[PDB]
């Protein structure tokens, strides 16, 4: 795309989600782009949500990756 000031991909986090409804999962680690680790879940209906990397279940899933 085009950007001169890179910024975080999520503003707020969701703790209410069902694993079955999740279609794709992506992880953005901390780097020059954004301070906080981001976990983006794109659901089967086209909606995407941002999850807490500190959540126990999601934290374990990310660590397994």
């Amino acid at each position: 795309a085009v950007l001169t000031e890179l910024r975080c991909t999520c503003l707020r986090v969701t703790l209410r989600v069902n694993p079955k409804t999740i279609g794709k999962l992506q992880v953005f680690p901390a780097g020059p782009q954004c301070s906080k680790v981001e976990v983006v879940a794109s659901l089967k209906n086209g909606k995407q949500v941002c999850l807490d990397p500190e959540a126990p279940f999601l934290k374990k899933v990310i660590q397994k990756i």
Partner: protein
């Protein structure tokens, strides 16, 4: 329910094309003006007054900035695909030229204040340090621009195209905020304070004069100050707004992100005209340079 969701960084092709055209036009105009000023000054060594040295240095700074502009235009076209070494070199040169131009405007203002206010006294003998002042300004700009050289590299992301961004660590986002205090402190606040003080007292002394040509001098001084403000105020205001938004002082929304992001580019484009308008504002507005240019035409 729908509060939490990704925000898409949005862009349009028309903006890209417009930026390309504007940057090229500014490149050509700045090159022409700076080259003409340098040719006029250097051709004949008759009366190499201090203002001549200052205008020479200012023209060199603007010419270098214009020379660096095209790579920035390409970066805006498609992001930084030109490599890390070019990112470092171009960023260093750009920042050094920007700092030197601003501080040279400040020094010219100081010279005018010491020339028209403290004119009868012996303090006027302290303005013959143009060589040392200019060298010191170049050195200070060079030293202040090294953070760009040390901590700038190509940055990759899945949704954002390449750009010559900073790489200071995993919490670099906050670090850039502290870094920004430099350009916004010794780049707008100190220079604006010096110019305001100097030109205000110069205006007072001229207003208390019975000369025959007070009018044009007052007009030119006001023109210089207003042009500087019109050129650089929006960029600094948008920068402060962006820093506050990253500080969560101002409520942050995806649309606010998009607005500020577009405003940054627009204000940068508007401000860049400091390299184009300087030759007319400072040099060609005086009869000496017009006479010299006409004489050289033989």
């Amino acid at each position: 329910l729908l509060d939490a969701a990704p925000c898409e960084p949005e862009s349009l092709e028309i903006n890209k094309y417009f930026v390309v055209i504007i940057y090229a036009l500014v490149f050509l105009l700045s090159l022409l003006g700076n080259s003409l000023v340098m040719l006029v000054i250097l051709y004949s060594r008759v009366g190499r007054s201090v203002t001549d040295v200052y205008l020479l240095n200012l023209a060199l700074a603007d010419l270098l900035f214009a020379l660096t502009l095209p790579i920035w235009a390409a970066s805006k076209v498609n992001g930084w695909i030109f490599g890390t070494f070019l990112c470092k070199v171009v960023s260093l040169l750009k920042e050094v030229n920007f700092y030197s131009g601003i501080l040279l405007l400040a020094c010219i203002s100081v010279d005018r204040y010491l020339a028209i206010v403290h004119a009868t006294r012996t303090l006027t003998q302290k303005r013959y340090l143009v060589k040392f002042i200019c060298l010191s300004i170049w050195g200070l700009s060079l030293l202040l621009a090294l953070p760009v050289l040390l901590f700038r590299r190509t940055v990759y992301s899945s949704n954002v195209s390449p750009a010559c961004y900073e790489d200071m660590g995993n919490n670099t986002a906050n670090w850039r905020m502290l870094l920004r205090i430099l350009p916004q402190s010794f780049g707008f606040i100190v220079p604006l304070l010096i110019m305001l003080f100097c030109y205000g007292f110069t205006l007072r002394t001229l207003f208390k004069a019975h000369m025959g040509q007070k009018h044009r001098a007052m007009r030119v001084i006001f023109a210089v100050v207003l042009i500087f403000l019109l050129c650089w105020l929006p960029y600094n205001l948008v920068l402060l707004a962006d820093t506050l938004m990253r500080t969560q002082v101002i409520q942050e929304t995806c649309e606010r992100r998009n607005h500020i992001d577009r405003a940054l580019d627009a204000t940068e484009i508007l401000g860049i005209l400091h390299s184009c308008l300087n030759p007319l504002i400072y040099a060609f507005i005086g009869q000496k340079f017009r006479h010299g240019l006409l004489k050289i035409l033989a």
